[PDB]
């Protein structure tokens with residue numbers, strides 16, 4: 676599936692001063708509805724082999740975050756978490772969502788989705804999350820050891836690595852898929868970032884936002900602390916954690932969420948970009964989760 680083939684099935688809608696591209700399986704159809712949120716450095720294309728398993732059960736939306744995929748670029752090249760939330764938040768209001776939705780999310784898309792859910796709790800049918808931002812990083816012994824890499828990316832070498840050498844696309848992304856991407860799959864991911872310079876800025880700002888205790892930005896830390904607190908006691912919100920084996924953040928997520936009520940776990944084969952190694956098994960687990968939702972079980976503990 677080429678990039679042009681994927682985006683040919685996608686829509687665009689104005690958002691604030693810009694526009695966002697997005698996949699919509701059933702525009703205008705008020706039914707069971709699932710929103711898929713990608714992360715860094717991917718796009719809605721990441722969900723292309725997952726959505727077909729969910730589409731029979733739900734209208735599927737998968738937006739391109741601002742500055743990414745086929746969505747607009749911001750002329751000031753500010754793509755902090757709050758910048759992204761601004762546009763995603765407005766996007767939610769513009770695609771005719773029913774009263775409650777299910778969020779499926781990955782990486783920084785789970786940061787944005789968790790926060791959106793925290794701020795619209797009455798609209799959350801359920802949350803599927805994987806390789807997700809579930810808490811502030813307080814110890815590098817509980818987490819993958821990227822301390823030195825984050826420091827490196829925060830320095831001036833970050834601009835060279837990403838703006839000029841597109842590090843996240845050309846090295847990080849394929850390093851954390853187990854299979855080898857086809858070269859039309861790789862071009863799909865290169866496509867939004869082919870012009871060197873500031874078009875790649877979103878893939879540099881995103882790791883610069885990572886919520887590290889005593890090193891991460893206070894606004895992202897407060898947002899994460901506050902949706903982590905909410906999720907930790909969200910007994911009324913059904914949740915699926917898709918664990919990637921061996922994964923990247925998966926092991927740290929496994930233990931950060933031990934205490935969370937009403938969360939089931941399913942493990943699949945994968946590193947960070949698990950959707951490219953087990954698309955079908957991720958798709959089936961979502962369909963199972965969605966079939967169980969409709970039973971609206973009254974859980975005891």
Ligand SMILES: O=C(Cc1ccc(O)cc1)Nc1ncc(-c2ccc(O)cc2)nc1Cc1ccccc1
Nearest residue numbers: 782783806807808809824847851882885923924947
């Ligand atoms: O900052 C993030 C977002 C994030 C996701 C989950 C989570 O629990 C906390 C934060 N991710 C990130 N941020 C920075 C880096 C990173 C940067 C440089 C480097 O040499 C290695 C990893 N990696 C990553 C994730 C990643 C992506 C692809 C492959 C491996 C790992």
